[PDB]
């Protein structure tokens, strides 16, 4: 009887392992083709850094482009 | 001043191209990041590449 | 921390709600910042005038 | 133009306030999402 409960629990563990493997493969195929599935936390950190880069780039581009557009307005009045 | 307008138009084009490209690229990066931190946020460590293969033995027991 | 029991038994659905909030976060903050920045430059123009 | 400065400063204040409150509440929600999918991602 102990082995019966062990069997059920282990079957659920196999289920979760296949879930993780399938999801890993599908992502690693969607972005990349085989993308360090063994330890992928570092890529999450770098992608967060690239989101910070997103904020920086978008703000800088917007403010600079619109400021030089205002310079264009000054030139137009001139 | 018309020379200035010409060069400024070129620079406006460059700014617009750069902002568009960067926002698209980092947006796709954001989507991939969210898929990772949704589906497998350290779930790989729960998996741990164990490959238990012991259900057969439990069935024999 | 958020809610009091708020269907913790299977809380998957809440994450989607928070995802909508997360996207709206980027939209709202980007637009607001851009507006205030536009008027910062307009303020500089008025100062220079 | 000084009157324009005054109204512009009011509007700048409104946007700064709105963004501050908005980002605070939305950031709290985002942090809740991260805690959910870090501590209990269908764990």
Three-class DSSP labels, B41-55: CCHHHHHCCCCCCCH
- In B, which residues are within 8 Å of D42 by CB distance? 43
Burial A14-52 (b: 16+ CB within 10 A, else e): eeebeebbebbeebbeebeeeeebeebeebbeebeebbe
Of D23, A11, D30, the residue nearest B55 (C-alpha):
A11
User: Residue C11's closest CA among A38, B3, D42?
Assistant: D42
List of residues 6+ apart from A16 with CB closer than 8 A: B46, B47
Alpha carbons D26 and C25: distance in angstroms, whole number: 6
Distance in Å, alpha carbon of C42 to nearest chain D alpha carbon:
8
- Among residues B43, B46, B53, the alpha carbon closest in space to that of A10 is found at B53
The Cα–Cα gap between B26 and A51 comes to 6
Tokens of B36: 């990772």
Rounded CA separation D35/B59 (Å)? 39
Name the CA dihedral angle for D23, D28, D34, D36, rounded to a multiple of 10 degrees: -150
Backbone φ and ψ of C5, nearest 5°: -130, -40
Give pairs for A52-59: CB < 8 Å, separation 24+.
A53/B26, A54/B22, A54/B23, A54/B26, A54/B27, A54/B29, A54/B30, A57/B18, A57/B19, A57/B22, A57/B23, A57/B26, A58/B19, A58/B22, A58/B23, A58/C30, A59/C33, A59/C37
D35 min Cα distance to partner chain C (Å): 10
CB within 8 Å: B8 and A72: yes
Q: Give Cβ neighbours of residue B9 (< 8 Å, ≥ 6 apart).
A: none
Other Cβ atoms less than 10 A from the Cβ of D40: the count is: 10
- Contacts of B15-23 with C-beta under 8 Å, sequence gap 24+, read B15/A61, B15/A64, B15/A65, B15/A68, B16/A65, B18/A57, B18/A61, B19/A57, B19/A58, B19/A61, B19/A62, B19/A65, B22/A54, B22/A57, B22/A58, B22/A61, B23/A54, B23/A57, B23/A58
**Residue located via tokens 């997360």:** C22
Coil, helix or strand for B1? coil
Q: What tokens were used for B53?
A: 């293969």
| Alpha-carbon distance B7 to nearest alpha carbon in chain A (angstroms) | 11
Experimental method: cryo-EM
Q: Which of A70, A76, A77 to mutate to test the interface with C (most CBs of C within 10 A)?
A: A70
What contacts C13, CB < 8 A, 6 or more positions away?
A: C7
CB within 8 Å: C28 and D23:
yes
Q: Structure tokens of B29?
A: 């990066």
Query: CB-hemisphere CA count at 13 Å for C2?
Result: 16
Among A47, D28, D7, CA closest to C43: D7
**Cβ pair C39, D6 in contact under 8 A:** no
CA distance C22 to C19: 5
Q: Which of C23, C24, C29, C48 to mutate to test the interface with D (most CBs of D within 10 A)?
A: C29
Rounded to whole angstroms, the Cα distance separating D25 from A6 reads 45
């Amino acid at each position: 009887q102990p082995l019966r409960m062990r069997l059920s629990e282990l079957e659920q563990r196999l289920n979760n392992q296949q879930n993780a493997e399938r999801l890993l493969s599908e992502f690693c195929k969607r972005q990349g083709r085989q993308y360090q599935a063994e330890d992928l936390e570092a890529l999450q950190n770098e992608l967060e850094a690239r989101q910070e880069a997103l904020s920086l780039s978008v703000n800088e581009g917007g403010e600079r482009r619109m400021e030089m557009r205002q310079e264009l307005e000054q030139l137009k009045q001139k | 001043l018309r020379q200035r307008h010409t060069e400024l138009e070129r620079e406006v084009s460059r700014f617009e191209d750069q902002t568009q490209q960067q926002r698209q690229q980092y947006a796709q990066a954001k989507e991939s990041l969210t898929t990772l931190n949704r589906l497998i946020p350290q779930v790989t460590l729960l998996l741990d590449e164990t490959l238990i293969d012991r259900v057969e033995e439990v069935r024999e027991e």
